Amino acid sequence: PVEVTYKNMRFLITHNPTATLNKFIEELKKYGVTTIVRVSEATYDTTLVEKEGIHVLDWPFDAGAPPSNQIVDDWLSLVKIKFREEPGCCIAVHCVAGLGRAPVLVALALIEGGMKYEDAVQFIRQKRRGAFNSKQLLYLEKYRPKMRLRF
């Protein structure tokens, strides 16, 4: 469980539980996460998660493949609204391995928050070493930001 914080944003990058749901739920609730963004095939049932009060959003894309335009647009709007309506909260992004798709979204949040892509890569790699493969680093390098988040 690795946590990334920048300005008004706080993220928890997680993976499929190593160990079962109860420990997982308790940990998320303790971190203040109000939303889980699952971008891959997930190994747990949402029904218990939602009963605990954490909405799950399922925006999957292929491992190593870049997220669709819609996914990026939807993610950036969620980041824009959620942290303002619930200041101090945490957003969880979940990946199969917690090394590619989930850090990629967090990198996009950091870039749209003012970081250049190399700053964001290092910012996440400081918390989760070995994140991002070559295909994914190139995507972050080529990404051209909308630059519409306000702080």
Residue numbers in the entry: 9 to 26, 28 to 160
Question: Could you pull the original sentences from the published paper?
Answer:
We use this C49S/D72A double mutant to determine the crystal structure of the cysteine-phosphorylated form of PRL1 (PTP4A1). Small crystals of PRL1 C49S/D72A were obtained with 4′-MUP in the crystallization solution to maintain cysteine phosphorylation. The asymmetric unit contains two PRL1 molecules. PRL1 displays the characteristic cysteine-based phosphatase fold, composed of a five-stranded central β-sheet surrounded by two α-helices on one side and a four-helical bundle on the other side. The omit map clearly shows the density corresponding to the phosphate attached to the catalytic cysteine 104. The positively charged side chain of the catalytic Arg110 interacts electrostatically forming a salt bridge with the negatively charged phosphate group. Hydrogen bonds from backbone amides in the P-loop and an alpha-helix dipole stabilize the position of the phosphate. All three structures show the loop closed with the aspartic acid positioned above the phosphocysteine, ready to initiate hydrolysis. The structure of PRL2 bound to CNNM3 shows an aspartate sidechain inserts into the PRL active site interacting with the arginine in the PRL P-loop. A side-by-side comparison of the structures of the PRL–CNNM complex and the phosphocysteine intermediate shows the phosphate group precludes the CNNM aspartate entering the PRL active site. Mutating the alanine to serine increases phosphocysteine hydrolysis more than 15-fold. In the absence of both aspartic acid and serine/threonine, the phosphocysteine intermediate of PRL1 is stable for weeks.
